């Protein structure tokens, strides 16, 4: 049905570029800066790479070759293309290392992404077959609707007063006729459950006035109706009467495609010291000391809250390259806003010495010159 | 001429304009790519080479086998092509075919990350040493850049305190 030229373009590589996804959502009513913009929470464009023989020529599979001054010399060839050809007849591109290397630095932590917990710490993977599911059947009941993570309806608490009115006017209002049918299908289960439970000692499923009365009966118990309305509009659960309905469901996969490990329950076998007690520590940078009374640390390019415990209390211009702290990444999770939040904890003393020993920074090596 | 119509023209239009204007190329996979990469934003951080070698990639792609094909890397595109195949041949639905190809994609990514860690751990057990990693190289670059900011702040704060104190006309020196 398509010409041989159109058949090649379809399976082409440039045609397989993913569309630019919307940026990570922020406070809608809050002010921002439009001129300047820093790194985003998660990437929105695809990072591109070439062969070393092609990069020297500036060929990146794009319309035109890129300038060599701004694309050669570095170690990791990474580029983000905003427009393959803009109104200035140039390929508006930028470096893609801010996110390309943030992914490699994160995966160097060797930690999975667990489901958000409430405060008995039980880290459960997000790739479990019982929770990580998106295809549901119309017979899918309510008790199993909490395991899902991808809902078609919006989170009512997250919408603004304006977005909620537009939703009520254009999504739920024209679905009244369909909802009445949804009740009739339930009546088919209400008249058969009591009519087929004694046979082991379907209904017409089409009514007009019986539905009007059944809905009135539910006015005394509003909870049983919300579960019936939400199940139809496919709304994410809100309150317990369980799946972390505090901040809402995630706008992406619970892992966000940054890590695919399913557990950290393993021991690192050291060449000389055998297995280790905890995973190797990672050095972090101190940002925004307490003296907001909360501190921020940069671990593998991500910003997280400092350990619950100086260098993190007051700024010190004497320290070269800023204040740095060795820590251990206990848990990593993806909030409902798409951010990756780490629960950092202070690292032990002996561990930091073991890590520094391999790289050649330990002052008193634990091996050889350690009589006690 | 009348350009190729990649999408059906609006039938309700009675006086259509832009008849001699090329139309947008859209495939059934566009809807699928947007779904996957929105559920896996950090999948865009994995660099992908859109540079063509000989244009003969689609000659060895048989998506009836699995996600691992010849010539192309395991990427979000593989899930979309595998999903589209299931959603058309095996009659699965958009969500069902999505979950299947999506789960096959995770188990392969897990082995890739588990192999890096184990490959480095065993190398040291037999006298194998490596260079600096990104965690260390990334921090050193921040140090060198943090210093540049310190010099700027130290030189920029002196401007305000000096210009601030000199704001008053205390030059009389009474």
């Amino acid at each position: 049905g398509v010409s041989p030229g159109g058949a090649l373009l379809r399976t082409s590589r440039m045609f397989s570029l993913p569309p630019v996804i919307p940026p990570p959502p922020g406070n809608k009513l809050q002010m921002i800066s439009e001129r300047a913009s820093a790194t985003e929470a998660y990437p929105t464009h695809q990072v591109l790479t070439t062969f070393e023989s092609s990069r020297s020529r500036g060929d990146w599979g794009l319309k035109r070759p890129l300038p060599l001054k701004s694309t050669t010399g570095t170690t990791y060839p990474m580029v983000k293309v905003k427009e393959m050809d803009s109104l200035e007849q140039i390929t508006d591109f930028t470096s893609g290392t801010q996110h390309g290397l943030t992914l490699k630095k994160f995966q160097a932590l060797n930690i999975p992404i667990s489901t958000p917990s409430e405060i008995r710490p039980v880290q459960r993977s997000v790739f479990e077959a019982d929770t990580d599911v998106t295809a549901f059947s119309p017979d899918e009941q309510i008790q199993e609707a909490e395991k899902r993570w991808k809902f078609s309806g919006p989170w009512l608490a997250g919408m603004t007063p304006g977005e909620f009115k537009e939703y009520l006017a254009k999504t739920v209002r024209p679905k009244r006729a369909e909802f009445r049918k949804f009740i009739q299908k339930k009546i088919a289960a209400q008249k058969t459950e009591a009519a087929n439970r004694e046979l082991q000692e379907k209904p017409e499923s089409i009514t007009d006035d019986e539905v009007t009365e059944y809905l009135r009966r539910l006015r005394n118990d509003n909870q049983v109706l919300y579960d019936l309305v939400g199940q139809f509009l496919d709304l994410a659960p809100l309150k317990p009467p369980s799946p972390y309905g505090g901040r809402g469901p995630p706008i992406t996969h619970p892992s966000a495609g940054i890590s695919y490990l399913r557990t950290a329950a393993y021991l690192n076998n050291h060449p000389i010291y055998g297995p280790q007690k905890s995973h190797p520590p990672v050095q972090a940078r101190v940002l925004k000391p307490r003296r907001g009374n909360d501190a921020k640390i940069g671990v593998a390019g991500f910003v997280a809250d400092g350990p619950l415990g100086s260098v993190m209390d007051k700024f010190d211009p004497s320290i070269e390259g800023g204040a740095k702290l060795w820590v251990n990444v206990d848990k990593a999770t993806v909030d409902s806003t798409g951010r990756v939040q780490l629960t950092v904890s202070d690292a032990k003393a002996t561990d930091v010495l073991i890590a520094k020993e391999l790289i050649g920074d330990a002052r008193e090596p634990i091996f050889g010159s350690a009589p006690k | 001429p009348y350009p190729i119509q990649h999408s059906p023209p609006n039938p309700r239009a009675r006086k259509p304009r832009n008849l001699f204007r090329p139309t947008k190329i859209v495939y059934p996979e566009d809807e699928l790519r947007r779904d996957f990469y929105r559920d896996h934003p950090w999948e865009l951080a994995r660099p992908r080479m859109i540079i063509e070698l000989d244009g003969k990639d689609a000659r060895f792609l048989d998506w009836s086998k699995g996600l691992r094909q010849r010539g192309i890397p395991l990427s979000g595109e593989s899930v979309v092509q595998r999903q589209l195949w299931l959603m058309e041949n095996q009659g699965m639905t958009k969500q069902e075919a999505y979950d299947k190809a999506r789960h096959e994609f995770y188990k392969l990514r897990q082995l890739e990350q588990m192999e890096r860690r184990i490959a480095v751990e065993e190398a040291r057990m037999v006298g194998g040493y490596f260079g600096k990693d990104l965690l260390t190289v990334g921090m050193e670059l921040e140090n060198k850049t943090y210093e540049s900011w310190k010099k700027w702040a130290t030189t920029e704060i002196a401007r305000q305190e000096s210009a601030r104190a000199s704001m008053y006309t205390n030059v009389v020196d009474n």
Binding site: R291, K314, F315, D316, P317 | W149, K150, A153
Partner: peptide, 21 residues
């Protein structure tokens, strides 16, 4: 102890230059 007060002044000075939250 006054030598500790001037440190608080120098600290807050840099905190003002970090124009980012």
């Amino acid at each position: 102890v006054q030598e500790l007060l001037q440190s608080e002044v120098t600290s807050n000075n840099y905190m003002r230059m970090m124009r980012r939250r």
